[PDB]
Coordinates of C-alpha atoms in Angstrom, one line a residue:
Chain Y
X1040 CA 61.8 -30.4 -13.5
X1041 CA 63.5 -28.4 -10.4
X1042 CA 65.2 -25.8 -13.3
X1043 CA 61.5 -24.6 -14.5
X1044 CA 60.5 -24.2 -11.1
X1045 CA 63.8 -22.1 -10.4
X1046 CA 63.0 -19.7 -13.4
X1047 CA 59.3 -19.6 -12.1
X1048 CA 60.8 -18.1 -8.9
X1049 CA 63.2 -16.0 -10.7
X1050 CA 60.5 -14.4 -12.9
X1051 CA 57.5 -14.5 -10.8
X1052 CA 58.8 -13.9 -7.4
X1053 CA 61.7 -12.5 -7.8
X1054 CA 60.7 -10.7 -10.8
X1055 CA 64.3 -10.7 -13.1
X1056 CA 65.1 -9.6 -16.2
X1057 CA 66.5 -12.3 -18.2
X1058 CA 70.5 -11.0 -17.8
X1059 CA 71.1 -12.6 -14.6
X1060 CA 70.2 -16.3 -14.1
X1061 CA 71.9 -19.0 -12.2
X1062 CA 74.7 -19.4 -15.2
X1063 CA 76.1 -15.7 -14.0
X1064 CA 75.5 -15.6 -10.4
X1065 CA 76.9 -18.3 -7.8
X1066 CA 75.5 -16.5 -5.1
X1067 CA 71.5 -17.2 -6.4
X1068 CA 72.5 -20.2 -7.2
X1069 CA 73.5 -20.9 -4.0
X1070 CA 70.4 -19.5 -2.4
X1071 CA 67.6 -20.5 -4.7
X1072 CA 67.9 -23.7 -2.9
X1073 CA 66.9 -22.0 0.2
X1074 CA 64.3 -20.0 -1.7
X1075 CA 62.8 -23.1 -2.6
X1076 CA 62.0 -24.7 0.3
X1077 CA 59.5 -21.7 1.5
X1078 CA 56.2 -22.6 -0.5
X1079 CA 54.2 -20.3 1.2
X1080 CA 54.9 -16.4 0.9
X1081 CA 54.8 -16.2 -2.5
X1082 CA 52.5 -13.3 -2.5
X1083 CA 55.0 -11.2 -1.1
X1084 CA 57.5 -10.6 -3.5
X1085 CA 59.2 -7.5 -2.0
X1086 CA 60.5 -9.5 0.6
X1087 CA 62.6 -12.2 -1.5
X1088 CA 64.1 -8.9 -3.3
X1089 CA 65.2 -7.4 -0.3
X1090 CA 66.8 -10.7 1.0
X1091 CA 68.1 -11.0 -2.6
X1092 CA 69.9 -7.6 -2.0
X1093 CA 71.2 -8.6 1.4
X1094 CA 72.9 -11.7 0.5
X1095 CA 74.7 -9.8 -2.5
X1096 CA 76.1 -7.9 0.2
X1097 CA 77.2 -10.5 2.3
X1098 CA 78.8 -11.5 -0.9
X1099 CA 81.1 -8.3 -1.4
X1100 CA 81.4 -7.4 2.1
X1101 CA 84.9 -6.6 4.0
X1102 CA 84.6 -7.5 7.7
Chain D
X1382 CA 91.7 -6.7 25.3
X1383 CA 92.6 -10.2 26.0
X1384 CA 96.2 -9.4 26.4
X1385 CA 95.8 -6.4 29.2
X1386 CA 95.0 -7.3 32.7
X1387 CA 92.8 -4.9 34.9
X1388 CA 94.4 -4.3 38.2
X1389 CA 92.4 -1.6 39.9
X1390 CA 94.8 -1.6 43.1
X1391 CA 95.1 2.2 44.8
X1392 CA 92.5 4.7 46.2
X1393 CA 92.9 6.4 42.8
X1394 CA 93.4 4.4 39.8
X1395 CA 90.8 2.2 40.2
X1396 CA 88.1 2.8 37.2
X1397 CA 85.0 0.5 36.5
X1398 CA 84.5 1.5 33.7
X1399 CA 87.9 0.7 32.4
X1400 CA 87.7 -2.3 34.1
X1401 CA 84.4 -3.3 33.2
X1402 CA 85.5 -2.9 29.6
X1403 CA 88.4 -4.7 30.3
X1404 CA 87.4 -8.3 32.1
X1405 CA 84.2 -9.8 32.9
X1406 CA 83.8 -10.6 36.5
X1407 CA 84.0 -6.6 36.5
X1408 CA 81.8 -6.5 34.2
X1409 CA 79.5 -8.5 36.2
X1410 CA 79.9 -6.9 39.0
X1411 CA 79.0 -3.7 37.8
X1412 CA 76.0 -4.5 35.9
X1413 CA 74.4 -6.2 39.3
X1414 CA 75.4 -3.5 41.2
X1415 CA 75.1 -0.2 39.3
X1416 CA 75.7 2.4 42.2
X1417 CA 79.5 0.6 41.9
X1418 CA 79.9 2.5 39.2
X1419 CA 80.6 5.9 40.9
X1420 CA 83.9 7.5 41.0
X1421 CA 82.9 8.9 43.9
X1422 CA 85.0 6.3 46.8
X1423 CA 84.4 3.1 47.3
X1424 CA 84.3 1.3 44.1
X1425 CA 85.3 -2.0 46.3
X1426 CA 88.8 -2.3 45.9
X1427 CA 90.2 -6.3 46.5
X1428 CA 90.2 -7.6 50.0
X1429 CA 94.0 -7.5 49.5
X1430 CA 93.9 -3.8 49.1
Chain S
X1157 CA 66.8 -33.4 16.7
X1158 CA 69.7 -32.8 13.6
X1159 CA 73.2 -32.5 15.0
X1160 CA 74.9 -32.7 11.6
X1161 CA 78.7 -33.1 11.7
X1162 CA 81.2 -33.2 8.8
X1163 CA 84.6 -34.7 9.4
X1164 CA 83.5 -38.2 11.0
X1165 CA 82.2 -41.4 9.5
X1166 CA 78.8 -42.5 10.7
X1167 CA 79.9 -44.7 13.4
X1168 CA 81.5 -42.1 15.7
X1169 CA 77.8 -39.5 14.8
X1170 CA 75.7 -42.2 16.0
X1171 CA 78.2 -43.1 19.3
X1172 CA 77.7 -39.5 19.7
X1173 CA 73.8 -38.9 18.8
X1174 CA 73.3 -42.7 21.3
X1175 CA 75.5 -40.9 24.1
X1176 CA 73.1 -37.7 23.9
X1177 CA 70.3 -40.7 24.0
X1178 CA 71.4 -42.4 26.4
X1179 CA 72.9 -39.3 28.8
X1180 CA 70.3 -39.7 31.9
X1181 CA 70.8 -43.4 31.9
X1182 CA 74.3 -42.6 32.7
X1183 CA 76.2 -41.8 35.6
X1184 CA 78.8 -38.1 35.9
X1185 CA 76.6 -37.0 33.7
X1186 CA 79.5 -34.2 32.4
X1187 CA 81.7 -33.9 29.4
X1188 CA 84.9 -32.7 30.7
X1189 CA 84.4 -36.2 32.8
X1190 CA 84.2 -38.2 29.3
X1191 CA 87.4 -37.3 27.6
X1192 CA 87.2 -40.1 25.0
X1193 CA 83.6 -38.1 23.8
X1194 CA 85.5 -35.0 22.6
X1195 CA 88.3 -37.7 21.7
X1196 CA 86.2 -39.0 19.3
X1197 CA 85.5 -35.4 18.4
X1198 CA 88.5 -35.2 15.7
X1199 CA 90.9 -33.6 16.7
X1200 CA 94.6 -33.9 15.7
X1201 CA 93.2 -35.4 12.5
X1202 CA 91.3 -32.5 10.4
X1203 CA 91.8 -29.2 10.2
X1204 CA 90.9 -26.4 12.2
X1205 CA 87.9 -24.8 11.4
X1206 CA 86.5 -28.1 10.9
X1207 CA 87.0 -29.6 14.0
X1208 CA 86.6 -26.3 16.1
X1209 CA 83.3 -26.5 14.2
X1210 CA 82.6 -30.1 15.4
X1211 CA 83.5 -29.4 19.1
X1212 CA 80.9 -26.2 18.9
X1213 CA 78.5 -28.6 17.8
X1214 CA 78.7 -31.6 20.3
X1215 CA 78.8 -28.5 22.7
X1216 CA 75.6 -26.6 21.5
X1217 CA 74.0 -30.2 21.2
X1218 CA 75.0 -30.9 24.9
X1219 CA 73.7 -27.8 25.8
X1220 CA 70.2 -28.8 24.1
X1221 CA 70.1 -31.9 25.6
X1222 CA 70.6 -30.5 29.6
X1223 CA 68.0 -28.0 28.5
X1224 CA 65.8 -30.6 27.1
X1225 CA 65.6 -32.8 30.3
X1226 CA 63.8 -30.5 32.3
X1227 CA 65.3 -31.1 36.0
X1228 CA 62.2 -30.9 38.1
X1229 CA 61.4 -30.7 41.7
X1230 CA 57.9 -29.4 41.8
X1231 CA 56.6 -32.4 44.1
X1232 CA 60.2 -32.0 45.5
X1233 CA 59.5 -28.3 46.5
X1234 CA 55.4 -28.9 47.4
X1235 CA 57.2 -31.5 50.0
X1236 CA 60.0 -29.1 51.2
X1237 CA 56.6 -26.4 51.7
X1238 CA 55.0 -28.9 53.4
X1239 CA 57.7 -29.8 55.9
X1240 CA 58.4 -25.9 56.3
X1241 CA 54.7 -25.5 57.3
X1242 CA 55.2 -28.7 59.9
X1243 CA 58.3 -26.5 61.0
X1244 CA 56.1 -23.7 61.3
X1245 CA 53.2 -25.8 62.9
X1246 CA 55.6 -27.3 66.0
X1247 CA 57.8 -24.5 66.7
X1248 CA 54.7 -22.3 68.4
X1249 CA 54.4 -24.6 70.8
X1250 CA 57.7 -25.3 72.2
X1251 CA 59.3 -23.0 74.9
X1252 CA 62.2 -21.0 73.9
X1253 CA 65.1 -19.3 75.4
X1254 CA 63.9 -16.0 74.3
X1255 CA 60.7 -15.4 72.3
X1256 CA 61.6 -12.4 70.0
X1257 CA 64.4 -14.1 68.0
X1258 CA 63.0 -17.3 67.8
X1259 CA 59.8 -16.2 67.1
X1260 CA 61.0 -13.7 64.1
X1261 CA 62.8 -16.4 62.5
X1262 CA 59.5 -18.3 62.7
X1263 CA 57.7 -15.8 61.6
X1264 CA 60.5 -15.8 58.6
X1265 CA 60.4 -19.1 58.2
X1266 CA 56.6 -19.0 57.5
X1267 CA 57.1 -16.3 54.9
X1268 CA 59.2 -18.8 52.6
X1269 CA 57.3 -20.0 50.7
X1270 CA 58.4 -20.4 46.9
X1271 CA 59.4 -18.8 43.6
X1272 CA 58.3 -19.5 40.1
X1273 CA 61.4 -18.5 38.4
X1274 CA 65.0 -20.5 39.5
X1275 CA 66.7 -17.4 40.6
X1276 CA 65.0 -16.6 43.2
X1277 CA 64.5 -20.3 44.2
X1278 CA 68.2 -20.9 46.2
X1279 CA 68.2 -17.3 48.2
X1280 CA 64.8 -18.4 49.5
X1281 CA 65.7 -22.3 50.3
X1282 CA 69.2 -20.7 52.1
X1283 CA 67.2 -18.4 53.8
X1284 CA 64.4 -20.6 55.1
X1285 CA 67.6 -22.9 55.6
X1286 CA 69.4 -20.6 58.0
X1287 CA 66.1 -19.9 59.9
X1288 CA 65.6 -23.5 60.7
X1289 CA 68.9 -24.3 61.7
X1290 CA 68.7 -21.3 63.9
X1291 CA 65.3 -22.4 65.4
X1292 CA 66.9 -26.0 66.0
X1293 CA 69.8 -24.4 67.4
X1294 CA 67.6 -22.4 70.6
X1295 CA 65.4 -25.5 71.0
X1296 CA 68.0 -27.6 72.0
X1297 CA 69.9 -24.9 73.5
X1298 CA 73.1 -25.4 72.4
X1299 CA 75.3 -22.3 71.4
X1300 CA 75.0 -20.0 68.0
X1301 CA 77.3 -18.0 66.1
X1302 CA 76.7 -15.0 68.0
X1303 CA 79.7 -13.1 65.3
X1304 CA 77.8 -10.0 63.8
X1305 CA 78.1 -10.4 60.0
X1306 CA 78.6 -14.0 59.7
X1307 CA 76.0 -16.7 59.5
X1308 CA 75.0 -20.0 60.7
X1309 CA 76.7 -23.2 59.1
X1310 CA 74.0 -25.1 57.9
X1311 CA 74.1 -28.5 59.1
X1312 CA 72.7 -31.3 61.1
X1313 CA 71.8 -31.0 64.9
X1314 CA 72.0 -34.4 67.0
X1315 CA 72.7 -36.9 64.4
X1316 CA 73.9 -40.2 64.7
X1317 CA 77.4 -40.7 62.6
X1318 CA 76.2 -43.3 60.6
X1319 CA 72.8 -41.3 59.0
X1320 CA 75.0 -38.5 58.6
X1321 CA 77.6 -40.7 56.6
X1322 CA 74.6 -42.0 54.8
X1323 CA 73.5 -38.3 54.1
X1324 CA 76.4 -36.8 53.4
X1325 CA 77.3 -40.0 50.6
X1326 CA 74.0 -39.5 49.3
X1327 CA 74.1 -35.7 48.5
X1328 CA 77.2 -35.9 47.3
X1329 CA 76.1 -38.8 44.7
X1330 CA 73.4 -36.2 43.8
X1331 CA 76.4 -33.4 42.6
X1332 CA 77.4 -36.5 39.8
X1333 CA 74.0 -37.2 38.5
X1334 CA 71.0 -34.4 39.0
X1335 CA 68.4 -36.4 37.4
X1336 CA 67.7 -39.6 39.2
X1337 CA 66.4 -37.8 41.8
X1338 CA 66.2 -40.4 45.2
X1339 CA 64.4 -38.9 48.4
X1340 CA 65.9 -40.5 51.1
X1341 CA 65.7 -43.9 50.3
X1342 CA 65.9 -44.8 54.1
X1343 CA 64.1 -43.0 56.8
X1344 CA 65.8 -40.3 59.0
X1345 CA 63.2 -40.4 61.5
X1346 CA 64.2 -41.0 65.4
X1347 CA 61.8 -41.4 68.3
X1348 CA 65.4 -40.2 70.7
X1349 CA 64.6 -36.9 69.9
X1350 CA 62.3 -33.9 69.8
X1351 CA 59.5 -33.5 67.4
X1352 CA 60.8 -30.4 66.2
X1353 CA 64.5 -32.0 65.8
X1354 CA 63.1 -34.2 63.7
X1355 CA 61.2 -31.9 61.4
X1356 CA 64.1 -29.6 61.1
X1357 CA 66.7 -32.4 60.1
X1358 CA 63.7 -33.5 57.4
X1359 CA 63.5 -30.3 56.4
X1360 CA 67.4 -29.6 56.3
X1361 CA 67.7 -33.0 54.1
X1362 CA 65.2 -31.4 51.4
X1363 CA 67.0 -27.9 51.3
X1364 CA 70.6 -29.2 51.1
X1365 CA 69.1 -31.8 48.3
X1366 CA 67.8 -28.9 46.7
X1367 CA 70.2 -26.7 46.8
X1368 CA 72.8 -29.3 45.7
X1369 CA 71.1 -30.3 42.3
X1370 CA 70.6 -26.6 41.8
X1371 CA 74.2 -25.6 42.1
X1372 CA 75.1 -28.7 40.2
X1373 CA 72.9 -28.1 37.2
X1374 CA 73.6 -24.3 37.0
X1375 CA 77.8 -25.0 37.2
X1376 CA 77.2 -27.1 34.0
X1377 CA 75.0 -24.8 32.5
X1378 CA 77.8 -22.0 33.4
X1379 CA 80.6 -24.6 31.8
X1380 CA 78.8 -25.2 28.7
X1381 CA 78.1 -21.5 28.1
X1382 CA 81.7 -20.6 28.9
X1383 CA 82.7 -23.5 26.6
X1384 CA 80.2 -22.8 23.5
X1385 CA 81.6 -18.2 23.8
X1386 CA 85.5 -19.5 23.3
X1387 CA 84.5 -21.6 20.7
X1388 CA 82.5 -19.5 19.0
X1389 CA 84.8 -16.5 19.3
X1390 CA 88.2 -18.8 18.5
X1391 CA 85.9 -20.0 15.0
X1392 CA 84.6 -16.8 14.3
X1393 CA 88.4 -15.2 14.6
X1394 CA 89.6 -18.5 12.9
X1395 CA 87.2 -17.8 9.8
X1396 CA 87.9 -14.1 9.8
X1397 CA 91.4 -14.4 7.6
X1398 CA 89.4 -16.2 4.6
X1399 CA 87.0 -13.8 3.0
X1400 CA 84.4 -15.5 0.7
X1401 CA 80.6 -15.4 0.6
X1402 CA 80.7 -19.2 2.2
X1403 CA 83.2 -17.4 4.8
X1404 CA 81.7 -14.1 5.4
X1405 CA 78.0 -15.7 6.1
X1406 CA 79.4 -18.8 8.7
X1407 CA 80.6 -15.6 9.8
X1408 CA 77.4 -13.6 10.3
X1409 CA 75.8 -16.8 11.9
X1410 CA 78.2 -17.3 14.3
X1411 CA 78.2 -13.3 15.3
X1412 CA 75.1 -13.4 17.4
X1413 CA 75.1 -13.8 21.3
X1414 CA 75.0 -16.9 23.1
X1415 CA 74.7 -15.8 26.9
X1416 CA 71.0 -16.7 27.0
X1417 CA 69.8 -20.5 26.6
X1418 CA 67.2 -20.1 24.1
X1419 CA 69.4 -17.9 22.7
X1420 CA 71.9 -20.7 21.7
X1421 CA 69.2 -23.4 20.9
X1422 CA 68.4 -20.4 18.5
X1423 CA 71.8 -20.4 16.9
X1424 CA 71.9 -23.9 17.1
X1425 CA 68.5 -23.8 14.4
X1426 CA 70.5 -21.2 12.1
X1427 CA 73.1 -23.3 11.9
X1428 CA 71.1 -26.4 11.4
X1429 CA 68.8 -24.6 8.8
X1430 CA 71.7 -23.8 5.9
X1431 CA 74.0 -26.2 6.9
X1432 CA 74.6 -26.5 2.9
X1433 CA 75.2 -23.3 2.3
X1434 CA 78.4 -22.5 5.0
X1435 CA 79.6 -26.5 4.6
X1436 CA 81.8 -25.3 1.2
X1437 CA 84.8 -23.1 3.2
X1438 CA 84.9 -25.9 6.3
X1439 CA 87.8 -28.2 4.6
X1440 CA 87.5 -32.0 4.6
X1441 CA 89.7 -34.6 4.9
Chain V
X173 CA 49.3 -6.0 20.9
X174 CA 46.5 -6.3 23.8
X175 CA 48.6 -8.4 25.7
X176 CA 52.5 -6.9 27.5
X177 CA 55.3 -9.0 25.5
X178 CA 56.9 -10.5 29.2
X179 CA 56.9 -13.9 27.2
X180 CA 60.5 -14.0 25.9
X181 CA 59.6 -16.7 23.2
X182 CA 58.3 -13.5 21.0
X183 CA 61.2 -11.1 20.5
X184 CA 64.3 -12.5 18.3
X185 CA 66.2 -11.5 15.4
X186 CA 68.8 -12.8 13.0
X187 CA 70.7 -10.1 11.6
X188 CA 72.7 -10.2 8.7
X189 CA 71.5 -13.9 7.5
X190 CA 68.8 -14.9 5.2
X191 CA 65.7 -14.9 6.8
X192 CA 62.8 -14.0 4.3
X193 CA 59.7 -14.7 7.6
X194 CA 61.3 -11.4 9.3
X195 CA 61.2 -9.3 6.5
X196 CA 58.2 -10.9 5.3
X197 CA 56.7 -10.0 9.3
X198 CA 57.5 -6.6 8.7
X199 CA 54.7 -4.1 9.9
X200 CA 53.6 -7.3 11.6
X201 CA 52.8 -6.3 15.6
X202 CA 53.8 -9.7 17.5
X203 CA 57.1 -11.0 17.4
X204 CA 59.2 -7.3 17.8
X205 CA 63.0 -8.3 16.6
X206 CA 65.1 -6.3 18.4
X207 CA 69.0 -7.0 18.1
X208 CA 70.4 -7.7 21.2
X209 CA 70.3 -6.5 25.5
X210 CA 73.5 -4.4 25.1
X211 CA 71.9 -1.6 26.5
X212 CA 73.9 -1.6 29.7
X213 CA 72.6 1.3 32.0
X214 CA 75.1 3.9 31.0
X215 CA 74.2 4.3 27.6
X216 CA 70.6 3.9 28.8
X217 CA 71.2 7.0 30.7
X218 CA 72.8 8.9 28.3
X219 CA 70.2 8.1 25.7
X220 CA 67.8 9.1 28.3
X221 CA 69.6 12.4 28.8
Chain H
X404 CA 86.8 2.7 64.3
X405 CA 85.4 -0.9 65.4
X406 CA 86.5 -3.4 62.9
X407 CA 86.0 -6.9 63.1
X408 CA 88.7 -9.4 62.8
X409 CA 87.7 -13.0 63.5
X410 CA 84.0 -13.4 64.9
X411 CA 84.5 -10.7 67.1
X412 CA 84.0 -7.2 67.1
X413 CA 87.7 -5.0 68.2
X414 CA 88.3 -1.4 68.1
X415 CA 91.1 0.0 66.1
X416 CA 93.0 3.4 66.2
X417 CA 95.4 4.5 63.5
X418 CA 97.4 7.8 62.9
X419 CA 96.4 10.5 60.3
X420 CA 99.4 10.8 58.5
X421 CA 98.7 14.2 56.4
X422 CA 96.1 17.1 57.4
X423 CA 94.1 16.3 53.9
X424 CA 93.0 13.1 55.8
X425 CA 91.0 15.0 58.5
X426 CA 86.9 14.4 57.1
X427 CA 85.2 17.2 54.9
X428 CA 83.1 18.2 57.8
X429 CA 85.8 19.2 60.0
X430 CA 88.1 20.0 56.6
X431 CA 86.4 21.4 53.7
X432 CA 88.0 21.6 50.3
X433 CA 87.7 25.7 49.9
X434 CA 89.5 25.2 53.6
X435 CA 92.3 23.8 51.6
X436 CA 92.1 26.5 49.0
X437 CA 92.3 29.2 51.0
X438 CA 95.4 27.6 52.6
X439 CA 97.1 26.9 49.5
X440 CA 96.1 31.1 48.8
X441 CA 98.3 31.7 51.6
X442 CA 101.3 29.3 50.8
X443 CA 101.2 30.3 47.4
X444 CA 101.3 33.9 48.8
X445 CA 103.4 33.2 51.1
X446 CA 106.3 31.8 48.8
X447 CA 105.8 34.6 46.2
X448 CA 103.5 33.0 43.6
X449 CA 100.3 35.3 44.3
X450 CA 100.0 35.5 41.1
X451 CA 100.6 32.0 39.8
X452 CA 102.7 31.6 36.4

């Protein structure tokens, strides 16, 4: 099913710990569903962290 | 900004770029015409003034 | 081709997505023209955001769809090039008042010959325009703005009232609708006249023509810009007193620049490509 | 790259949005995402300067 | 000067109204300093406050 291939991303991609998950973070749970759509570019993980980082900071920004 | 009104008007006083910060047909008229910009004279003034 | 609103039932998306369709097989071929359109739009029915939201849509969507039809006038311009160089061609041999200025505007006229970008395209039809008009004006010797400063009204010299009716009508029909493009569905030409009278008022039919679907199309494209900035500014100020990720990243979308054309089909994509993820803080219903 | 980037369909960039291609196209040569024209030419001077 | 009005091309004479509105090259600016030196002399305020 779709939540295997979620935790695929989130440990091989994204490369996680197991603390955070989808259960304690709306924010990847809101953007694994983007994530998931881009088949190719797996290979560069780096990338997905950094937009990782930038959308937590779209999620505690002020302005 | 949208609440103050340029009105360059005198000999003096007249400023593009407060005005040009200020509206955007000055603005425009700046940015085609860059040697406008001087403080130097004629900045045109209106055909009014 | 995915113009996604979210405060209408599917009857009033698919009036609005078969309008779009059906746009160049219409006539006034304008929104502010079609007030039951943005009627249908929402308004005075949902809330703010939402509906400001649906208006920047049907207006970024009518934005895409001008830029999509491609208004061209290549054959158009090859002909007005051609009649220029038939211009050119029949006013060496013709006796003038003078031959300096007649033969300088000439010499301008055959040194008019197109652009590649649209810019550039109405100063060089105007020009070539005045230069004709100018010629035509010493051939049949009648008088000329002689004011320093000013130029020549651009016009028609020695027409009957009737073709000029016709003319007039006809490049006036052109300002409502700038696609079906109709080169003088009658003939202008008149054996009453000079040669060169009759290759200037051929030639003054295809610059006015030209010149009036240009203007047209870049008045709307100046609207719809002007339209898609307010809305874009009053939405982005509208989401800015609800904080929230949903709020803070239709936010970030909507802070780019729209000033260029590609630069709004652009943000028309980015809104299109995560249209789930900003669609929680719009309200519905 | 070999060729001069006159072609405006290469330079764009979203800023502030997910996009994981322009990260992902970094120390890529083509598609050079710049942020926006504002560089109006008084500050170009001034940067100049 | 020759203006222009309405397609045609009349003269037009106007008074000076002050001596600062006599042109730089018969009325420098140090001109003008100098002659405010000598009014400021003049009225007692050589040395300025």
């Amino acid at each position: 099913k779709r939540d295997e291939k979620h935790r695929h991303v989130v440990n091989v991609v994204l490369e996680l710990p197991t603390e955070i998950s989808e259960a304690t973070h709306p924010v990847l749970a809101t953007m694994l569903s983007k994530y998931t759509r881009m088949s190719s570019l797996f290979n560069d993980k780096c990338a997905f962290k950094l937009d990782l980082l930038r959308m937590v900071a779209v999620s505690r920004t002020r302005r | 900004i949208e609440y103050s009104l340029p009105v360059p008007f005198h000999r003096f006083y007249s400023n593009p770029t407060i005005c040009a910060a200020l509206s955007d047909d000055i603005k425009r008229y700046v940015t085609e015409f860059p040697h406008y910009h001087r403080h130097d004279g004629g900045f045109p003034l209106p055909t009014a003034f | 081709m995915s113009l996604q609103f979210i405060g209408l039932q599917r009857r009033d998306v698919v009036a609005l997505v078969n309008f779009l369709r059906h746009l160049t097989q219409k006539p006034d071929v304008d929104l502010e023209a079609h007030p039951k359109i943005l009627k249908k739009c929402g308004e005075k029915r949902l809330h703010r955001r939402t509906v400001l939201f649906n208006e920047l849509m049907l207006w970024l969507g009518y934005y895409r769809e001008l830029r999509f039809h491609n208004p061209d006038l290549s054959s158009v311009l090859e002909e007005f090039e051609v009649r220029c160089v038939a211009v050119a061609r029949r006013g060496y041999t013709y006796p003038f008042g003078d031959r300096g200025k007649a033969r300088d505007h000439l010499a301008v006229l055959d040194r008019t010959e197109f652009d590649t970008d649209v810019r550039h395209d109405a100063e060089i039809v105007e020009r070539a325009l005045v230069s004709a008009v100018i010629l035509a004006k010493m051939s049949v010797r009648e008088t000329l703005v002689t004011a320093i400063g000013q130029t020549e009204p651009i016009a028609f010299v020695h027409l009957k009232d009737t073709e000029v009716q016709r003319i007039e009508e006809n490049l006036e029909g052109v300002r409502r609708n700038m696609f079906c493009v109709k080169p003088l569905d009658l003939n202008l030409d008149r054996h009453a006249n000079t040669a060169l009278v009759n290759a200037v008022n051929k030639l003054v039919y295809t610059g006015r023509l030209i010149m009036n679907v240009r203007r047209s199309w870049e008045e709307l494209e100046r609207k719809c810009l002007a339209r898609i900035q307010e809305r874009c500014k009053l939405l982005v100020k509208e989401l800015r007193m609800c904080l929230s990720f949903d709020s803070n990243y239709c936010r970030n979308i909507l802070k780019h620049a729209v000033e260029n054309g590609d630069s709004a089909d652009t943000l028309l994509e980015l809104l299109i490509e995560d249209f789930d993820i900003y669609v929680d803080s719009f309200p519905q219903s | 790259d070999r060729q001069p980037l006159n072609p405006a369909n290469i330079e764009a960039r979203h800023h502030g949005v997910s996009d994981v291609p322009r990260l992902g196209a970094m120390d890529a040569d083509e598609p050079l995402f710049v942020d926006d024209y504002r560089a109006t030419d008084d500050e170009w001077t001034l940067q100049k300067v | 000067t020759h203006c222009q009005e309405n397609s045609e091309t009349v003269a037009l004479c106007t008074p000076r109204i002050v001596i600062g509105n006599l042109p730089d090259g018969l009325a420098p600016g140090p001109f003008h300093e100098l002659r405010t030196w000598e009014i400021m002399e003049h009225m007692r305020l050589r040395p300025p406050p």
